[PDB]
């Protein structure tokens, strides 16, 4: 490409909405897994 | 034009060749007119 070329993405807004949906659900699964992990490690130490 | 575009000139080499000729000849015309300034100031002054 000579110098800098402008390029345009297809459906960027819809892709952002689904990205937010996947990230937020993925982050919740991190909290749920962490909560269960600490629950077991609370009992194991106790 | 978005960002910087590349453009290509038509016959750049032939145009440079003819540019030197016109510049060089006009330099000769300057010297000739200076000579007429000297042969006319020697006669008068
Ligand atoms: C969970 C769903 C979260 C959606 C977040 C959307 C953020 C993107 C955004 O700014 O959306 C503006 C309006 O959104 C919309 O109109 C779409 C909102 C989501 C629709 C309902 C989902 C359920 C478009 O405006 P922008 O130009 O800033 O878009 C940026 C994209 N590149």
Swiss-Prot record, chain A:
**This chain belongs to which protein, by name?**
Gap junction beta-2 protein
The entry assigns this protein to a family as follows: Belongs to the connexin family. Beta-type (group I) subfamily.
Query: Where, by residue number, does the polypeptide cross the bilayer?
Result: 17-37
Role according to the record? Structural component of gap junctions. Gap junctions are dodecameric channels that connect the cytoplasm of adjoining cells. They are formed by the docking of two hexameric hemichannels, one from each cell membrane. Small molecules and ions diffuse from one cell to a neighboring cell via the central pore.
Oligomeric state and interaction partners are given as: A hemichannel or connexon is composed of a hexamer of connexins. A functional gap junction is formed by the apposition of two hemichannels. Interacts with CNST. Forms heteromeric channels with GJB4.
Q: Tell me which disease this protein is linked to.
A: Deafness, autosomal recessive, 1A: A form of non-syndromic sensorineural hearing loss. Sensorineural deafness results from damage to the neural receptors of the inner ear, the nerve pathways to the brain, or the area of the brain that receives sound information.
Q: What is the primary gene name for this protein?
A: GJB2
Q: Which organism is it from?
A: Homo sapiens
Q: Which domain of life is it from?
A: Eukaryota
Q: What is the lineage of its organism?
A: Eukaryota, Metazoa, Chordata, Craniata, Vertebrata
Localized where? Cell membrane; Cell junction, Gap junction
Swiss-Prot record, chain B:
**In which compartments does the protein localize?**
Cell membrane; Cell junction, Gap junction
The transmembrane segments are 17-37
Question: Please, which domain of life does this record's source organism belong to?
Answer: Eukaryota
- Which disorder is it associated with? Deafness, autosomal recessive, 1A: A form of non-syndromic sensorineural hearing loss. Sensorineural deafness results from damage to the neural receptors of the inner ear, the nerve pathways to the brain, or the area of the brain that receives sound information.
Q: How does it assemble?
A: A hemichannel or connexon is composed of a hexamer of connexins. A functional gap junction is formed by the apposition of two hemichannels. Interacts with CNST. Forms heteromeric channels with GJB4.
What does the protein in this record do?
Structural component of gap junctions. Gap junctions are dodecameric channels that connect the cytoplasm of adjoining cells. They are formed by the docking of two hexameric hemichannels, one from each cell membrane. Small molecules and ions diffuse from one cell to a neighboring cell via the central pore.
Question: What is the official name of this protein in its record?
Answer: Gap junction beta-2 protein
Taxon lineage: Eukaryota, Metazoa, Chordata, Craniata, Vertebrata
Q: Which gene encodes it?
A: GJB2
């Amino acid at each position: 490409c000579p110098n800098t070329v402008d390029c345009f993405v297809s459906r960027p807004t819809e892709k952002t909405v689904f990205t937010v949906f996947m990230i937020a659900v993925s982050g919740i699964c991190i909290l749920l897994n962490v909560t269960e992990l600490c629950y077991l490690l609370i009992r194991y130490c106790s």
